[PDB]
Amino acid sequence: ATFTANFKDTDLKSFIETVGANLNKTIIMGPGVQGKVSIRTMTPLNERQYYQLFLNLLEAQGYAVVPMYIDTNNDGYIEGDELVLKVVKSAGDEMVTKVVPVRNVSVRELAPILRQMIDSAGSGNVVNYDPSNVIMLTGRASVVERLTEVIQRVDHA
Template sequence: MINAAIAQESYILNYDNVEVKKITQDIASFAKKTIILDPRVKGRVTIFSNTALDQNQVWQVYLRTMQVNGFSSITEDGDIVRIIPENEATRDENIVLNDAEFLTKVFLLENRLVEEILPMLKPITGRQSHLSSIPSINSILLVDRKSNVNRIETLIKELDANDAAKISIIKLENLSSAEAVRILEKLKLQNYPSMNNFIAIPFTPSNSVILSA
């Protein structure tokens, strides 16, 4: 659903596991675009923004969401845009998104500049993810697997709340990242003074621990 403030031409995106066709219909209306969906473009996606977006920003969020989910946009005459599967010649005839596999979210920063936070996050996004800034509203646009979005959201909140906070990525060789984080959290619960002001998150793709302190 798009909650629209028509007078200001701004929109808040709120789609939880919604059919691509329905989202496309809404986006076409508010972005004033004619969108043609290839019959193979099917499935459900999730998009959230915690701040109002203007018409162009809504359109960019939609395009990035389609891209990360394996679809491309082709602009034709005027405002006609076709959404088709990437590498369509090598794909099956029935392309379906994995339900809720990817999540699109816009994070509004309140205390720090997006140019400062964005470089810290790039090393921990997935290969198929999209991470970019929306400078006009000091926000970060992230499209990634749901589990990774949740991890990064925790980090963004910590980084935004503490202007001295930084991210460190520690690659492990002899211990799993999940076990390392479990040990750190256990020490934290024991009220070690030097262990209280940090967030530790396992990053299993590279068996690393992401520390924010």
């Protein structure tokens, strides 16, 4: 099960509200959530990766997501599908997101290289290491392309 998305100049509040619908999750919004969001999925994402995208895009704007476990039926069980989320103030430039499989190496091995690249690329660019041995990249497309080539070079080298 996967998510693709293309958002151009979208009100933050409307972005947030869409992710909630996609994920089937109640999102509660703090006061003064405002701003603009743009993103495009170069590859499909699965639910975790999409949620990570979410976290990534809100963070760029200065907004943190806080998960809350609420028991709406007083049964003493809070099932995963019923987590609530609270949002609150904490061409080569296109905002894109991509999943890169890594076939021959543990992904965490690549950290100290990518750490250097992201520090240099500057803010808005984020690498996420998935436990299934794939790296997720969010940031400016030129940067995402330069990370993708370094990931793949090291993989097949």
